[PDB]
Ligand SMILES: NC(=O)C1=CN([C@@H]2O[C@H](COP(=O)(O)OP(=O)(O)OC[C@H]3O[C@@H](n4cnc5c(N)ncnc54)[C@H](OP(=O)(O)O)[C@@H]3O)[C@@H](O)[C@H]2O)C=CC1
């Protein structure tokens with residue numbers, strides 16, 4: 001079972017200049033809760049944005065180039081990434097844009113953070129038909145001292 005987890009601003013913006021154009025410690029907490037002790041598949045741009053391994057998860061990096069960090073697992077293809085996860089209940093695909101594009105069709109589950117922010121972006125979450133998806137869980141949160149935007153945590157299931 002392949003799952004995507006992503007945080008979407010207004011207009012499906014997920015990124016700008018190899019970072020997320022916001023600062024939502026509550027989102028990173030949600031991300032950590034839902035990824036801990038599961039394999040994570042990320043693209044090389046995302047790996048470099050994060051800048052260090054994600055503790056409690058097998059870190060699988062997609063890159064056509066040879067690896068540059070002995071602590072994580074490097075793969076050269078989707079099929080290799082997926083085999084590198086092994087026999088697990090849930091594969092977590094954690095970004096970015098190009099990687100989401102490739103796994104969304106294989107994905108059974110979406111973990112979305114809807115962020116109330118109209119921010120400039122160079123990377124967007126892939127388009128998809130919502131007819132194909134059923135909302136399972138949502139949870140709304142007001143902005144606070146540490147989170148300048150309101151947000152909603154939603155889980156969706158294919159059909
Ligand atoms: N809002 C959110 O939830 C999140 C936001 N982001 C944002 O996403 C953006 C980055 O996304 P994007 O630019 O698409 O890049 P990605 O992070 O998806 O990484 C792309 C790179 O991954 C490698 N790669 C991807 N697919 C393959 C494949 N099939 N075979 C081999 N190598 C592959 C390549 O590395 P190489 O070039 O070395 O071959 C490619 O250049 C950033 O702005 C980041 O902040 C990311 C995570 C979460």
Ligand SMILES: COc1cc(Cc2cnc(N)nc2N)cc(OC)c1OC
Nearest residue numbers: 005006007027028031049050094095113
């Ligand atoms: C833990 O820190 C990061 C995590 C992520 C991935 C990510 C973050 N939030 C959500 N909701 N989904 C994701 N896939 C992406 C990041 O930057 C691109 C991070 O660095 C701040």
Ligand SMILES: [Cl-]
Nearest residue numbers: 043098099102
């Ligand atoms: Cl690519």
